[PDB]
Structures are given as C-alpha cells and as structure tokens.
Ligand binder design. Sequence first.
Ligand code: MET
Ligand code: MET
Ligand code: MET
Ligand code: MET
Lengths: 160, 158, 160, 158
Amino acid sequence: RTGIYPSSDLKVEDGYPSSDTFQIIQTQDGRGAGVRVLKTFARGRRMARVSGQITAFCRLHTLQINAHTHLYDPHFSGLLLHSCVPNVRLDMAGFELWSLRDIAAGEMLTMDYASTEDVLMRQFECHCGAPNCRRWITGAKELPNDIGQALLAGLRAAAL
Amino acid sequence: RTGIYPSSDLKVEDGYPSSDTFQIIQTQDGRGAGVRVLKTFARGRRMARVSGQITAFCRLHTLQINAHTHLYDPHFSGLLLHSCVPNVRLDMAGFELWSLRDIAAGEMLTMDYASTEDVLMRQFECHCGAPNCRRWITGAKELPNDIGQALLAGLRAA
Amino acid sequence: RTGIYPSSDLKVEDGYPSSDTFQIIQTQDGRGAGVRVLKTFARGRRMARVSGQITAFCRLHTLQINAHTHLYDPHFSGLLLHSCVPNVRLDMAGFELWSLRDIAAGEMLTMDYASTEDVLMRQFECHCGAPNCRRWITGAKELPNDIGQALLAGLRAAAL
Amino acid sequence: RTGIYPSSDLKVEDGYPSSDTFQIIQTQDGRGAGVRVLKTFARGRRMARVSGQITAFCRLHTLQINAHTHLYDPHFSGLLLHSCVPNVRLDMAGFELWSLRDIAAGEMLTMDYASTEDVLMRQFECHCGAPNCRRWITGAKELPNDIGQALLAGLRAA
Ligand code: MET
Ligand code: MET
Ligand code: MET
Ligand code: MET
C-alpha cells in the first residue's frame, strides 16, 4: 500500500496513514483545507500512527510535544482543521490519531487545537457552528489578542 | 490562605488551590459531586497548580501522566466531573488547571475525561446536556462496553 | 511485607520498595546518608517502583520529571547519594529504579544526579573517588558557581 | 553557517549543529565512527539542538523519547559512540546536547547509551578503557544476552 508521509521509512503496514484511508483536501490555490477520511471508523479506534520532524519552535503545522518541543508535520497531522466538537484526538505521547466519535467515510477529521497547543501561531475565528463553540480560537495557555476581544467582548451583546 | 491539598508542602501563594476559591461538593455521604469555583475566571488563565501521588495503576481519582504512570489526586483534580464541552483543561505536563472559557463564580468545573485518559476505571452515561455530547463516556483508547453499545444503539433509534 | 513509602496505597507486592530489600542509612544526627540494598541484584533488573508527591519547585529530595515538574520523595529515591560511576539509574518516565551494574547485598545505591537533574538546589564536591569523577557536582544544565571554579579551576594545576 | 541536518528548516543560528563545529567520522565505507567536536566546549553548555523523525520502533540510530516512541536521527545524535564515562548528555525532553564535562577541540563525543535507551538494537563489548567500564553494553532495562554473559564471566576470572 501507499502512505502520506513522503519518507520511505514509515510503512502503512505498521499503522502509518495510507492514501487508501485518508485524503488531503485542497483549496482553490493548492493549499490546506483539512483531511478527509475514506474508511468508516467506530469511536475508540487508532486511526493512524503520526510522525514528523522534531523542532524547537511553534509554527503553522507544528503540534506540541511537551513544554518546549514540537512536531513539525506538514504532511498529515498538522493539516487537521480545528473544531470545538472534534471527532479525533491527537495522542502526543504515543504519537497516534484516535477516533473520539463515530466517523463515517467521507467525514472531515477535526481536532480541538487547545487540547494539545499552549499557544498558536495565529489566533482565529471558528466556524464549526457548534452551539458550544468558543468563537475565537487560542492555545490553552493563551489570552485572546486585541482583535480577539472584539469578536468575543462584542458578541456578549447577545445578552439581549 | 488555606489550601485544598492537605500537605503543608503545597502553598496557596505558589498557585495551589485554596478553599476561598474552590469548593468540593459532597453528597449526603462521603462520595463527591464535583468541584465548584467560588470566583470568576477569565478564559486562558491558570486556575491552580495540581499535585498528588505518583502511582503505577489507573484508579478512581487518578489522572494519566504518561503511558504507564498516573497521578493519584483524591483531593482536587480527580474530583472533577466530566463534560463533553468542558470549561477547564488539565495540563498533565506542567500539572496545572487552565480555564478553556469564561467561568462565572459558582460554576461547576468540568473536564473532558477523554482528553487525558486512555481508559477509565468505569464507563458511564453522560448528562452534560450538550448537543454534541457522546452520551457514553470511555477513555480515548477504549471501546464502549456492551452496556455502552446497547445504550448507544437504543439511542440510535432516532 | 512492609514498605518504605509511608502511604498505605503503595504495596510491596506491586513493586514498591520493602524494608526487607532496602535500608535507609542514617547519619549521627538522624539525617540522610543514602540507601543500602540488602538483596543481591544482577544488572538490568527493576529494583523498585518509585512514588512521591508532585511539586513545581526543585528542592532537596526532589527528582526532575520534565522541564517544569519534579517528584518530591523524601522517603526513598530522593535519599540516593551521587556518584560519578553509579550502580543504579532512575527512570523518570516509568518511575522505576533499575540496576546499571551488578549490585551485591550491602552495597550503597548511587545515582548520577546530572542524568536526571537540570540544576541542583546546592552544588557540591564529590567523593566517589572514581578516576573519572567530575569533582564538582552540578545539574546537567548548570554552570559551576563561584566556589565551584576554584576547586575545578584550581585542580587544573595538576597539569604538572 | 551550514548545518549537519540536511533539512533547510533547521538553522544553525537557532542552535542546530554546524559542520564548522561538528565533524562526522566515517570509515573506509559509509558506516560511521562517531562525532568529533572541532571547537572547545566548557562543561554545562548547550552544544546543539537535536532533531530527527518520530518513529514507533527502536532501531539503529534511534534515541528513545518515551516508553513507545523514538527519534530517528542518522545525521547527528544517533551517530554518537557510547562511553561509560561520557562527555555529553542527551536531553530527550528538550531535545538538546549538553556538555557533561570540559571538552577539548578534537575530542570524540560520547554518551552513555543506557542513560536514554531501554533496550539496544544490538549489545556489544565496550572499549572505553575506563576503570569502571561495564565492558558489555545493553539498554538500561535489558539483561546481557548469552554472549554478553559469557564475556562477563570470562572477565570474572580475575
Ligand atoms: C494545525 S497544527 C496546530 C496549530 C499550529 N501549531 C498553528 O499555530 O496553527
Ligand atoms: C476524575 S479522575 C479521571 C478518571 C479516573 N481515573 C477514573 O477512572 O474514574
Ligand atoms: C538527591 S535528589 C536529586 C538532587 C536534589 N534535587 C538536590 O537538589 O539536592
Ligand atoms: C547511537 S543511537 C542509540 C542506540 C540505538 N538505538 C541502537 O540500538 O543501536
């Protein structure tokens, strides 16, 4: 079978993601728009092993390993879009992707950025439309920036 | 100030939780019913340092540190009830409680058990009310047992 | 059997240290002078599980867990004396004590402080007398202090 | 400056190793023979940031990150020869190479394989010369195999 990680040392037979199970979804410009699953996963299953390059600096497409070290993965896990009600969890100790919900073929895989990331490279507005969405997305240890308040501290006019 | 953790080694002025900020909710007997905040917390703030005793075995009131080690904390963090839309996050590398969202004084503190735990000592039905609530709660690496599959099926009659 | 950790939740049958295997060695004043073993351990064996209290601050009797968190263990592992040729290793991920060398009953268990500790609460002079001893003991990420140089930067007179 | 790691994502000015500081020693063919420092390093200094590729399987040139994950680094840190009295320490939480003692320009860089590795892809006889050298090298959680027990016994004839 064939794998997403371009390195030849990561084999699909060991658990690494296969293009027969996962699909990188593209924008109009040939950029990032998440990852689509193409087999059906029941919740509580390991969907894939994760790899990448060790780096000391948080960036786009890095995932946090521990307090000072991150995993640079522009091929797979770093492409996952945020959601406030994710269907997948990143286990950054075993380096594995696990189904939180039941996931049907064709569904978009989503993760809560704040469950792994202290801070993000860029805070942003969320469109998962979950009623419990946070609207403005930051790392778990990161305060909203000055744009962030506005959308937040403004949408608190929804008092009425 | 006086602290939730019995140990006199852990000091409130170093960020360990104080009863003037956290109330432990008990039932008619001794079994617990969550932790409530007495003060308001803005999102993205450290609410408390966490502590406990190292142990090798997952248990009631343990939180997972790494693949084979767990933190036994029956005084504070192991008392947090689960929710599928939690207001707090447990950081098990720095051992700290952070607010995921704005928390009003009096609010119950809830965490997603699956975001730290591989497996749970017991699976159980969830009543978080949330629209996206998984209804049946396991560890992240744990399949629903037959009871859980049954309820999950009886709910799939929709 | 009976265990060193005073907490009753840590059982000897699960691997936690027993006073039938280990002995806390005392000074003249009822203070710390290491840990003596009283069974024979071949190298490459797990001698004991380790426990203690989570703390955020490095102290005497704390062992480093990760970049910002330490294990306060005044009962067992924090009593171990330094050596530049240790016979035991602390596995701070599994929380376990393992024999590096062959260890005969009655031997003192010793560990290289710099293999787990970024910095120490107090730097000190070493007396393991190993020919490859470092003489002045610091954490792995810690420079000798101003006393430290002297013993070091002086004992480099041993040029002749 | 030009860096040991092929990846152009890792920059020397951020502390990743440079060939003006580190020389990789090759044998008559392609198999390696250690890493040598070209500059002097005082003890207690960060000599390099480390990197590599995450992998699930212990292997030649992997260093262990945690109980089930390993760092594949055939360019730098996985090339360090073992010594029972090493001059450098690998920090696998911060991913950095630190000097344990004073290191003169030209010196070989050596680490104690047992201080990071549970088990080794292969056990082997050690020639560090040190008085306290264990003579036979395994992982920290690994018993000497029959070859190693034999040599350890043939040495016990002392
Ligand atoms: C999608 S990877 C996790 C977030 C990334 N580090 C960022 O800052 O955008
Ligand atoms: C509230 S502590 C987290 C889960 C606990 N270890 C259990 O199994 O019940
Ligand atoms: C013997 S426990 C490890 C060293 C201790 N943290 C100290 O600073 O002395
Ligand atoms: C120099 S890399 C450390 C050990 C390596 N994993 C091996 O088994 O050979």
